[PDB]
Amino acid sequence: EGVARVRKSKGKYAYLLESTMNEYIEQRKPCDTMKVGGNLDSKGYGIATPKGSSLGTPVNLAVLKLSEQGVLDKLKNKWWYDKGECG
Amino acid sequence: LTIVGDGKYGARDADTKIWNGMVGELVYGKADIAIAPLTITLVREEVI
Amino acid sequence: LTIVGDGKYGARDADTKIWNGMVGELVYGKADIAIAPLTITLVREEVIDFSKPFMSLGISIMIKKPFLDPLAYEIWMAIVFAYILVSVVLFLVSPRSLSARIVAGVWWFFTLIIISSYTANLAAFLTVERMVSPIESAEDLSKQTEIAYGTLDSGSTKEFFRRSKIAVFDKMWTYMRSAEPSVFVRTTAEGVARVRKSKGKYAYLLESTMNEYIEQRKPCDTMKVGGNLDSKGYGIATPKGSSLGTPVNLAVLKLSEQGVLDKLKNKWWYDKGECGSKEK
Amino acid sequence: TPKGSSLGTPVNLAVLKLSEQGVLDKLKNKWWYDKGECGASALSLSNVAGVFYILVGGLGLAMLVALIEFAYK
Amino acid sequence: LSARIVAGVWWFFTLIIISSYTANLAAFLTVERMVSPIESAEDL
Amino acid sequence: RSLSARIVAGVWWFFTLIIISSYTANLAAFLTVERMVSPIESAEDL
Amino acid sequence: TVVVTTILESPYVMMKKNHEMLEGNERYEGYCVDLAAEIAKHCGFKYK
Ligand SMILES: CC(C)S(=O)(=O)NC[C@H](C)c1ccc(-c2ccc([C@@H](C)CNS(=O)(=O)C(C)C)cc2)cc1
Ligand SMILES: N[C@@H](Cn1cc(F)c(=O)[nH]c1=O)C(=O)O
Ligand SMILES: N[C@@H](Cn1cc(F)c(=O)[nH]c1=O)C(=O)O
């Protein structure tokens, strides 16, 4: 809805959103949107478990395992810049 | 895999003090884990 | 505040399986907490607890930084000798005679060619500098020879290459282990000094943070090139089961959200920086 | 394969199977251009000399046209 | 005045020519490269 | 050669100088661009 | 086992750097070695 508002306001509306979605839409049809400037802050997405879960620690270890194995980067490229239509 | 009921990420209303969204589903035991673009916050790290 | 005894970050010797460095000091109870540029790894996370990371980075590549130029120095001379040689032939001819007239025609075509060449080549030269790069991508750097490249003796960069099962990084590790003379250095300063003193024959692989820092420091002769090889972050480490772990973690993300961490980063990196302005 | 081999036809089928699955191309790239160590303004100092030849030569012709010009009398 | 209009047209002509030479030479010095003569097998 | 006519020759000279310089520069840029590989040619890009 | 004959032409079949510390078909690497493995896969035979 925000991006649609950007496209239909013809420059009269700017949308503040996480860099990820911005970078994604920048690569998507009809490639009429753009990410401008740097970022306002720097944070990250994480997998959340109910505190005291028997699943917490192995999931965490799994996440950083996947990060070091290049899995996360490969997936990022898969869904962002491989399916990207203007890249 | 299940889609969060109210389609929200999560926050606490400062009146009801109830968590909504995926965080809400985690805290209140409606789901076992959340795998989504969930941004890490202070208040969320406090409850999950 | 105490400086780690052996000046190491931490790893297990593959024989003794003893932890050294700051992680070692934590595990064996010589220190209560570690606050340093400590990269979060799987194996480190297995023996200590990492707070949410307070700074993001990635392994990256550092290299040594790299009006009469369009026209060769020999030709500027040749232009002068041709100048006096034409003025001397014209001097030998002395409205005007037709032969003397054709001299001006050939000389005109000559200087036309010269100035056109200067303009074209200068156009390339100006277009080229923004466009030009010795090596942009990591794989390309790996492919290049005679430009040796290396990492620190201990740490995540070296271990990243040792563990990496991904093609290019595997090839690079296979190269580094056999490289002679040794391409590994004992301090970051040593690596950067090696970059500066190899005159482009040595590239240094180091975390983006140190790279970005040195890029801003005197004599500003080093440069970060390409993107990053991976993406990870530094975290504050506590001995697992510490009474300080959760409040320290909460404090770290508290500082991150209040803009404190960004503020400190700018304070020590780009405020004390002595020079990131690239102009195409 | 030795002709009449029990291995001939399945090996052949396997070869074209691998070709269609992109395996052969991938292997070619793996051993040729992946392990490849060479993959791929200043000034031109020599070229201008080529113009100098036409310059000096023309000057020589001019010199001649000058001499014959002063030689008509 | 005929000679003048001729000189004008020829001037525009040589202007275009040298401009084209300069531009194309600029493109040629900015991009591509030549190393080998590309000798034909029969030539070899 | 009136002075006004002289300043006319000067300004017009600067004008045509700018014009031929711009034509040369832009034509050079266009030719440099053509040397760069087309986006269409790549399959992924297509 | 099926005896495969090949030739030491780089980079089709090459001696591994540590071939001295290795034995059997682990001594060799190259295009034709990997190709031999794939052919063995799709034909279902062991090879030497
Ligand atoms: C070891 C790896 C799992 S990792 O480094 O932790 N994650 C890998 C992945 C590529 C990655 C890498 C780095 C970061 C990251 C992002 C932001 C920060 C700082 C700016 C703030 N940290 S924070 O957790 O987002 C904040 C809310 C406190 C620090 C690190 C997030 C994710
Ligand atoms: N990811 C956020 C929610 N969220 C989602 C968006 F698409 C966005 O642009 N901004 C945002 O805060 C969260 O975790 O609450
Ligand atoms: N920070 C690393 C050690 N470390 C330090 C560096 F300056 C570097 O360039 N590479 C590296 O692995 C760790 O935590 O082990």
Curated annotation (Swiss-Prot), chain D:
UniProt site (Interaction with the cone snail toxin Con-ikot-ikot): 17
Top-level taxonomic group: Eukaryota
Regions crossing the membrane: 48-68
Cellular localisation: Cell membrane; Postsynaptic cell membrane; Postsynaptic density membrane
Summary of the tissues where the protein is detected: Detected in forebrain. Detected in dendrites of neuronal cells. Expressed in the pyramidal cell layers of CA1 and CA3 and in the granule cell layer of the dentate gyrus.
Covalent lipid sites (S-palmitoyl cysteine): 71
PTM entry text: Palmitoylated. Depalmitoylated upon L-glutamate stimulation. Ubiquitinated by RNF167, leading to its degradation.
Regulation: induction: Down-regulated in the pyramidal cell layer of CA1 in the hippocampus by global ischemia.
Assembly and oligomerization: Homotetramer or heterotetramer of pore-forming glutamate receptor subunits. Tetramers may be formed by the dimerization of dimers. May interact with MPP4. Forms a ternary complex with GRIP1 and CSPG4. Interacts with ATAD1 in an ATP-dependent manner. ATAD1-catalyzed ATP hydrolysis disrupts binding to ATAD1 and to GRIP1 and leads to AMPAR complex disassembly. Interacts with GRIP2. Interacts with GRIP1. Interacts with NSF via its C-terminus. Interacts with CACNG2, PICK1 and GRIP2. Interacts with GRIA1 and SYNDIG1. Part of a complex containing GRIA2, NSF and NAPA and/or NAPB.
Domain notes: The M4 transmembrane segment mediates tetramerization and is required for cell surface expression.
Task performed by this protein: Ionotropic glutamate receptor that functions as a ligand-gated cation channel, gated by L-glutamate and glutamatergic agonists such as alpha-amino-3-hydroxy-5-methyl-4-isoxazolepropionic acid (AMPA), quisqualic acid, and kainic acid. L-glutamate acts as an excitatory neurotransmitter at many synapses in the central nervous system and plays an important role in fast excitatory synaptic transmission.
Miscellaneous field: The postsynaptic actions of L-glutamate are mediated by a variety of receptors that are named according to their selective agonists. This receptor binds AMPA (quisqualate) > L-glutamate > kainate.
Protein family (similarity comment): Belongs to the glutamate-gated ion channel (TC 1.A.10.1) family. GRIA2 subfamily.
Protein name (record): Glutamate receptor 2
Organism: Rattus norvegicus
Gene encoding the protein: Gria2
